[PDB]
From Swiss-Prot, chain C:
GO terms of molecular function: DNA-directed RNA polymerase activity; nucleic acid binding; zinc ion binding
Residue intervals of every TFIIS-type zinc finger in the record: 65-107
Gene that encodes it: POLR3K
Similarity-based family: Belongs to the archaeal RpoM/eukaryotic RPA12/RPB9/RPC11 RNA polymerase family.
Superkingdom, natural source: Eukaryota
Binding site for Zn(2+) 1: 5, 8, 25, 28
Pathology linked to this chain's protein: Leukodystrophy, hypomyelinating, 21: An autosomal recessive neurodegenerative disorder characterized by global developmental delay, loss of motor, speech and cognitive milestones in the first decades of life, and diffuse hypomyelination of the white matter and atrophy of the cerebellum and corpus callosum observed on brain imaging. Clinical features include nystagmus, ataxia, dystonia, and spasticity. Other more variable features are feeding difficulties, poor overall growth with microcephaly, optic atrophy, and seizures. The disorder is progressive and may lead to premature death.
Name by which UniProt lists this protein: DNA-directed RNA polymerase III subunit RPC10
Annotated effect of mutating residue 41 to W: In HLD21; decrease in expression levels of RNA polymerase III-transcribed genes such as 5S and 7S ribosomal RNAs
Location in or out of the cell: Nucleus
Main location: nucleus
Binding residue positions for Zn(2+) 2: 69, 72, 98, 102
Swiss-Prot record, chain D:
Shown chain mapped onto the complete sequence: 1218 to 1333 of 1390
Similarity comment: family membership: Belongs to the RNA polymerase beta' chain family.
Complex and partners: Component of the RNA polymerase III (Pol III) (Pol III) complex consisting of 17 subunits: a ten-subunit catalytic core composed of POLR3A/RPC1, POLR3B/RPC2, POLR1C/RPAC1, POLR1D/RPAC2, POLR3K/RPC10, POLR2E/RPABC1, POLR2F/RPABC2, POLR2H/RPABC3, POLR2K/RPABC4 and POLR2L/RPABC5; a mobile stalk composed of two subunits POLR3H/RPC8 and CRCP/RPC9, protruding from the core and functioning primarily in transcription initiation; and additional subunits homologous to general transcription factors of the RNA polymerase II machinery, POLR3C/RPC3-POLR3F/RPC6-POLR3G/RPC7 heterotrimer required for transcription initiation and POLR3D/RPC4-POLR3E/RPC5 heterodimer involved in both transcription initiation and termination.
Cell compartment(s), UniProt: Nucleus; Cytoplasm, Cytosol
Record's protein name: DNA-directed RNA polymerase III subunit RPC1
Gene name of this polypeptide: POLR3A
Positions that bind DNA template strand: 88, 106
Tissues with expression: Expressed in the brain, in the cortex and the white matter (at protein level).
Organism: Homo sapiens (Human)
Swiss-Prot record, chain E:
Domain of life per record: Eukaryota
Subunit structure comment from the entry: Component of the RNA polymerase III (Pol III) complex consisting of 17 subunits: a ten-subunit catalytic core composed of POLR3A/RPC1, POLR3B/RPC2, POLR1C/RPAC1, POLR1D/RPAC2, POLR3K/RPC10, POLR2E/RPABC1, POLR2F/RPABC2, POLR2H/RPABC3, POLR2K/RPABC4 and POLR2L/RPABC5; a mobile stalk composed of two subunits POLR3H/RPC8 and CRCP/RPC9, protruding from the core and functioning primarily in transcription initiation; and additional subunits homologous to general transcription factors of the RNA polymerase II machinery, POLR3C/RPC3-POLR3F/RPC6-POLR3G/RPC7 heterotrimer required for transcription initiation and POLR3D/RPC4-POLR3E/RPC5 heterodimer involved in both transcription initiation and termination.
Organism: Homo sapiens (Human)
Parent-protein residues present: 1036 to 1132 of 1133
Binding-site list for DNA template strand: 4-5, 11
Ligand binding (Zn(2+)): 45, 48, 57, 60
Gene name, Swiss-Prot/TrEMBL: POLR3B
Family from the record: Belongs to the RNA polymerase beta chain family.
Protein name: DNA-directed RNA polymerase III subunit RPC2
Curated annotation (Swiss-Prot), chain F:
GO cellular component: cytosol; nucleoplasm; nucleus; RNA polymerase I complex; RNA polymerase II, core complex; RNA polymerase III complex; RPAP3/R2TP/prefoldin-like complex
Pfam families referenced in this protein's UniProt entry, alphabetically: RNA_pol_Rpb5_C, RNA_pol_Rpb5_N
Keywords, sorted A to Z: Acetylation, DNA-directed RNA polymerase, Host-virus interaction, Isopeptide bond, Nucleus, Transcription, Ubl conjugation
Subcellular localization: Nucleus; Nucleus, Nucleolus
Cross-link entry Glycyl lysine isopeptide (Lys-Gly) (interchain with G-Cter in SUMO2), positions: 80
GO MF terms, alphabetically ordered: DNA binding; DNA-directed RNA polymerase activity
Protein role: DNA-dependent RNA polymerase catalyzes the transcription of DNA into RNA using the four ribonucleoside triphosphates as substrates. Common component of RNA polymerases I, II and III which synthesize ribosomal RNA precursors, mRNA precursors and many functional non-coding RNAs, and small RNAs, such as 5S rRNA and tRNAs, respectively. Pol II is the central component of the basal RNA polymerase II transcription machinery. Pols are composed of mobile elements that move relative to each other.
Name the record gives this protein: DNA-directed RNA polymerases I, II, and III subunit RPABC1
UniProt record, GO biological process: protein stabilization; transcription by RNA polymerase II; transcription elongation by RNA polymerase I; tRNA transcription by RNA polymerase III
Family assignment from sequence similarity: Belongs to the archaeal Rpo5/eukaryotic RPB5 RNA polymerase subunit family.
PROSITE patterns registered for this protein in UniProt: RNA_POL_H_23KD
Gene: POLR2E
């Protein structure tokens, strides 16, 4: 009976193409679905669209480039900003770019701490070359990482037309 | 009404509260020793527990049968009226009273000695009324007035009404079913 | 308190006469002049003080030459007496000791 | 282990008075009853109260709902300035319909009045 | 019809309709609850709002406003039960595009 | 008492200082950070200090628009303020020729004076606040987000971005406590900045109706 009431109250709600959620008459319920505009059915993290550490380990394992030099801290920040200022990243929100830049800053700090603990010069010439395997990240992996994050964020948005009130009613009544 | 009431840390003296309370109601207008003002000591209003009638003044445990008879015998030699309930049938025959094993009340008995009340050691009071022993227990003790009156219609249209005394205690006589069954089991 | 007429046994009411306040029946002539102070005390139940005294309350019952507590044999303890129910109860005695490396509760 | 502080669970239904007594930090106290928070702290605090309370009840039973669902449910209740129910009276205020309400209850009075 | 002994057929309840709403399957819900239960063509006059037949409104005596319109049979039954009760439903048809 | 009453008279005054700081009225900075011990200076306890004519405010002017636009703060003395008391404040206001005023009642108001305050005048608006409401700032609560009144030139850009009418926004009642706080009227649009779970912020809008 509770679910029947929730269905009859919520079933008219739908996500329009300008990403507002309007009722049957056309009054606005929400200006954007849930603040972010994202689908709960596509959440890879704990109520967040990605989990960046797992995606970065995915890209480090699927595309190892043994013939490429490992990046330092400053080179990582430089090539990350050189990727993120292109054309296609204007479609994403500001919050998602801030979260990507925050995570890249965290990874760069890990690289700096490891290369300070082990005395590894950033020129690429130290003799026990196994030391370059510790926090290895290459520009090819940075390109694939940023493209994979942008693709998952673009496919994780609430597609317009989705009967989202009925999803609320069933996901609470179940 | 001023709402912002003020308070202080000082501790109230015990006697100061006692004597203020004392002065609030110990005042008395009893100086009027007059007829209207006077009051009859034997017609006070009835406080509800009837044993506890006295609410205003000039200034209980339950007895048992052996204690009642001990007081009525040794403590006072004055006679006393009891009121005892008997069982429905007494172990007797109606003598030539035109019968069917009906009830045998006291109205079908004759005068004379009819039984012996045996008080045993330690509270047990039996009413040996023949071969069989009835048992005697203290009934529900009345506290209200019970007057034992007589009504004699000596003339056809008029007669005499006379009070014999006040009834205070009640007894109950009941058979001993344990003994009646332990004579012959069924 | 309910008080009832010796005559008819209806319930009395208090009223005022020409010399005194009177208990009076409503249905028969019986009246009773209130000559002296008469009272009826309710004695209601007060609040529980068990959690009120715990935790360094503003106690005051301690006095000079007070007894030491029996376990520690030091006077580093408070003691108090309170009614737990209405003030017709005889006051109960209780005491608590709080010392360094020593916590206990006693009666 | 780092601290020890005393919060005060109050079983009462007058939030305005509890917030205004001396010694209670009024800027950090909440409620369960959504209508009291609507009457005291506004409609938007009622929206936040409904969100936190549904998600509290769901977490105590080990079930998990993504917060966007209870967020949309709370925004559906408070888009007309006053907290409305999912009962038939609040549904009458949200939905204008006649046949929808005639399916629910009230044998023929809705149909004859709507004809009137 | 109702049960197995009448060769009756199953029931899209009040809950499976909700589940089909939740997918957003509009045409599947239309097909289930109209086309495979009771399909029926009415002709509704656009001027008076009453039902007609064969492209002819008997009320207005004209043929210049009626429209073909797919409708469930339960809805036509509802509308004629209401017109018998003198509660008139007047179907104002708008347009597409 | 007489520490808790001066505590209330401090806290109501500080709340009215922040309320007048929020509505766009010129609040001096010393009155916002006024500690209780500094409140002890110009104001005392019950017999010396008096509420109704010594703790008032009419200094507050809207420095954004015009300094002849001014706003009263009165602290009426009786708990149920009479209609005649309202007429006293109204004739004081009429002689002073200002249009906006507050009323900080103590226990409430009789319903006749409340019906008066609606139909006194459209030009003569007065706002009943209970003092039990003002003992905490509801804007500084953790459940009430930051509200911001919008200008007409931004409401027009909002309605042009989403291609709306005015009556399609979500509503907020006029009798709403935060709507009574900001002193907003029917027809205005407030911005609400809801705090997120992450470090972001979500923006929504409500029409007063
Ligand atoms: Zn009487
Ligand atoms: Zn100790
Ligand atoms: Zn026609």
């Amino acid at each position: 009976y509770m679910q029947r009431r929730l269905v009859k109250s919520l079933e008219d709600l739908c996500s329009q193409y300008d990403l507002t959620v309007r009722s049957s008459t056309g009054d606005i319920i929400q200006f954007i679905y849930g603040g972010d505009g994202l689908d709960p059915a596509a959440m890879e993290g704990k109520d967040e669209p990605l989990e960046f550490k797992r995606v970065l380990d995915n890209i480090k394992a699927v595309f190892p480039c043994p013939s490429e030099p490992a990046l330092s801290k400053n080179e990582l920040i430089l090539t990350t900003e050189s990727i993120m200022k292109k054309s296609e990243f204007l479609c994403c929100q500001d919050s998602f770019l801030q979260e990507i830049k925050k995570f890249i800053k965290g990874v760069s700090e890990k690289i700096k701490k490891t290369r300070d603990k082990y005395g590894i010069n950033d020129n690429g010439t130290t003799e026990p070359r196994v030391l370059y395997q510790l926090d290895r990240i290459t520009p090819t992996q940075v390109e694939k990482f940023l493209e994979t994050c942008r693709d998952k964020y673009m496919r994780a948005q609430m597609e317009p037309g989705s009967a989202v009130g009925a999803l609320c009613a069933q996901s609470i009544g179940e | 009404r001023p709402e912002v009431i003020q308070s202080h840390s000082i501790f109230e003296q015990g006697p100061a509260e006692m004597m203020k309370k004392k002065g609030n109601w110990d005042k008395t207008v009893d100086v009027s020793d007059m007829g209207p003002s006077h009051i009859i000591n034997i017609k006070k209003e009835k406080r509800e527990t009837d044993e506890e009638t006295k609410q205003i003044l000039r200034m209980l445990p339950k007895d048992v049968s052996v204690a009642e008879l001990l007081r009525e015998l040794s403590l006072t030699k004055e006679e006393e009226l009891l009121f005892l309930q008997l069982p429905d049938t007494l172990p007797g025959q109606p003598p030539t009273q035109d019968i069917a094993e009906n009830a045998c009340t006291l109205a079908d008995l004759t005068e004379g000695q009819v039984g012996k009340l045996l008080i045993r050691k330690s509270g047990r009071v039996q009413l040996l009324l023949g071969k069989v022993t009835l048992d005697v227990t203290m009934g529900t003790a009345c506290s209200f007035l019970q007057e034992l009156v007589s009504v004699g219609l000596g003339d056809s249209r008029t007669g005499e009404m006379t009070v014999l005394g006040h009834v205070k205690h009640k007894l109950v006589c009941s058979p001993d079913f344990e003994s009646l069954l332990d004579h012959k089991h069924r | 308190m309910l008080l009832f007429c010796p005559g008819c046994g209806n319930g009395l009411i208090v009223e005022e006469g020409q010399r005194c306040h009177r208990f009076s029946c409503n249905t028969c002539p019986y009246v009773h002049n209130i000559t002296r102070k008469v009272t009826n005390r309710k004695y209601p139940k007060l609040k529980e003080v068990d959690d009120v005294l715990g935790g360094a309350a503003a106690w005051e019952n301690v006095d000079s030459t007070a007894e030491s507590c029996p376990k520690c044999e030091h006077p580093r303890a408070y003691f108090m007496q309170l009614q737990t129910r209405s003030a017709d109860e005889p006051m109960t005695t209780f005491y608590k000791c709080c010392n360094a490396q020593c916590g206990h509760r006693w009666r | 282990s780092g601290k020890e502080k005393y919060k005060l669970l109050v079983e009462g239904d007058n939030l305005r008075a509890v917030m205004a007594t001396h010694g209670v930090k009024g800027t950090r106290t909440t409620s369960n009853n959504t209508y009291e928070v609507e009457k005291t702290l506004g409609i938007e605090a009622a929206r936040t109260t409904i969100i936190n309370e549904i998600q509290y009840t769901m977490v105590n039973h080990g079930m998990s709902i993504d917060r966007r669902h209870v967020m949309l449910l709370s925004d559906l209740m408070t888009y007309k300035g006053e907290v409305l129910g999912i009962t038939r009276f609040g549904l009458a205020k949200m939905k204008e319909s006649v046949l929808m309400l005639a399916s629910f209850e009230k044998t023929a009075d809705h149909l004859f009045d709507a004809a009137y | 019809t109702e049960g197995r002994s009448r060769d009756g057929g199953l029931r899209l309840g009040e809950m499976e309709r909700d589940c089909l709403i939740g997918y957003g399957a509009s045409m599947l819900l239309l097909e289930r609850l109209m086309i495979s239960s009771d399909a029926f063509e009415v002709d509704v006059c656009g001027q008076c709002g009453l039902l007609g037949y064969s492209g002819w409104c008997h009320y207005c005596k004209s043929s210049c406003h009626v429209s073909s319109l797919r409708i469930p049979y339960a809805c036509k039954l509802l509308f004629q039960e209401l017109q018998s009760m003198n509660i008139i439903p007047r179907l104002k048809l708008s347009k597409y595009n | 008492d007489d520490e808790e009453e001066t505590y209330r008279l401090w806290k109501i005054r500080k709340t009215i200082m922040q309320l007048c700081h929020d509505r766009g009225y010129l609040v001096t900075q010393d009155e916002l950070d006024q500690t209780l011990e500094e409140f002890k200076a110009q104001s005392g306890d019950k017999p010396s200090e008096g509420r109704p004519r010594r703790t008032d405010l009419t200094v507050l002017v809207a420095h954004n628009d015009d300094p002849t636009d001014q706003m009263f703060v009165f602290f009426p003395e009786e708990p149920k303020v009479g209609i005649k008391t309202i007429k006293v404040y109204c004739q004081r206001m009429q002689e002073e020729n200002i249009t906006r005023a507050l009323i900080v009642v103590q226990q409430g108001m009789t319903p006749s004076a409340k019906q008066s305050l609606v139909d006194m005048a459209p030009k003569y608006i007065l706002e009943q606040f209970l003092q039990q409401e003002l003992l905490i700032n509801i804007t500084e609560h953790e459940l009430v987000p930051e509200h911001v009144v919008m200008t007409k030139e931004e409401v027009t850009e909002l309605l042009a971005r989403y291609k709306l009418r005015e009556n399609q926004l979500p509503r907020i009642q006029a009798g709403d406590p935060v709507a009574r706080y900001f002193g907003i009227k029917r027809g205005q649009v407030v911005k609400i900045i809801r705090p997120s779970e992450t470090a972001g912020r979500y923006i929504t809008y409500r029409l007063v109706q």
